Each structure stands twice: as C-alpha cells, then as structure tokens.
C-alpha cells in the first residue's frame, strides 16, 4: 500500500513563520473516490504534534475542495470559493506562536479569497521545525480520527507546480535549496516525480 504519502519539498529548520506559493489546479481521474491534494504548511514531518496547513484537493469524479486544517483536528472545507481545472491558487499559512496562526487561500483566477485564524489551539502544538510544499495521498476517517483509510491516489495532469515558493524563519527568507525531496510512493513505486528548481517545486504524476 502507501509507504510514503507526501511528495514535494520539506525544509527542516526552526522558528518558521510563513510559507506561501501559488499552484495550479490539475484534472484528475482514477474513479469517483480517487483523490489527491496540494498544500502548504508548517510541521507534520519531523514534528508530529501538529500541522498548520491549507490547500485544495481533487477527486476522480471531477470535484474539488479548498480547505484548511490544524492537525490533529479534522480539516474543514472553505465556503466562499470555487476550484476549477486550470485555476491558479495562491496559498499561505502564518504561524504566530505554537498555538496560533492563520491560513489564506486566494483563487487568482476567480479573485475569490477565503481565510481562517487559529488561537489557543489545544488539540496540538506546532514545533515550527518543518515547512513544506506537498502533493499528498491523504486519508478519510470518522469524525474522531480513527478507522482511517488512505484514499486511492488519483492520477492527475498536468504536473502541479508550486511557484514563487516562499518560506521565512523569523522574518528571514529561507533557501529552498536545503529542502529535502520526497515522493509519494505506493507499493514501493513512485507515483509522483517531484523536483525543486529555483523558487518552483514541480510534481508530475508517474
């Protein structure tokens, strides 16, 4: 099954404050339930207690969803925005403390913009030691967070690309050159081919 569910760029550091990028909405197939998503966030890799993140997902039935999440709390979909094949989505998160922050999703194609703020989040605390641009095989569980299943990973195209990637550690821009590269791997085979070049993280389906 799924051995590696994250594909993209992961920076390992400390005191990360902001992560932002713009990404395009691809088309997807593979069945009604197949899915995939693109997002930006802080923590979730070496730091497992929490994740500040936002992005959009895609399903094989042609549907889409823009969302935000403060893991370990369940994610939530945004109501004032639409996601359509080809749209360009500016996404960004800002951690203001280990328990507070905000997420913003802007559809540069439809000019729509949604946002969410977080304060005194008790579920979990950020370590702010990870920053990333990811394409993920995510999961579906019950409200609680148990009985989970990874969703079938939808094939997609064209390659989803994170552009104008920006990260800051205490106000200072951080180099995307130290970033680690991961691939979504299923059954010990890569199903993504992600790569970094300049300020662009590019991932295509394999």
């Amino acid at each position: 099954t799924v051995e590696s569910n994250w594909g993209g760029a992961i920076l390992i550091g400390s005191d990360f404050d902001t992560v932002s990028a713009t990404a395009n909405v691809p088309s997807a197939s593979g069945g009604s339930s197949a899915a995939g998503t693109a997002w930006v966030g802080i923590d979730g890799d070496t730091c497992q207690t929490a994740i500040l993140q936002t992005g959009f997902d895609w399903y094989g039935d042609g549907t889409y969803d823009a969302w935000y999440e403060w893991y370990p709390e369940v994610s939530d979909d945004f109501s004032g925005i639409t996601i359509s094949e080809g749209d360009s989505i500016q996404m960004s998160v800002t951690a203001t403390s280990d328990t507070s922050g905000s997420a913003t999703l802007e559809n540069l194609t439809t000019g729509q913009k949604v946002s969410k703020s977080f304060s005194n989040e008790s579920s979990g605390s950020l370590c702010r030691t990870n920053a990333e641009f990811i394409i993920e095989d995510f999961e579906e569980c019950n409200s609680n967070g148990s009985d989970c299943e990874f969703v079938p990973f939808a094939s997609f195209s064209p390659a989803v690309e994170f552009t104008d990637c920006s990260v800051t550690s205490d106000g200072e821009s951080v180099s995307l050159d130290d970033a680690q590269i991961t691939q979504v791997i299923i059954n010990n085979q890569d199903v993504t081919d992600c790569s970094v070049s300049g300020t662009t993280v590019s991932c295509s389906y394999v």
């Binding site: 997002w39 890799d45 992005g55 999440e69 893991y71 994610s75 999961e139 579906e140 967070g145 989970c148």
Partner: peptide, 6 residues
C-alpha cells in the same frame, strides 16, 4: 472526514 501527517 478528511485529514491531511507524513
């Protein structure tokens, strides 16, 4: 319900 951890 959707959950985004590595």
């Amino acid at each position: 319900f959707k959950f985004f951890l590595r």
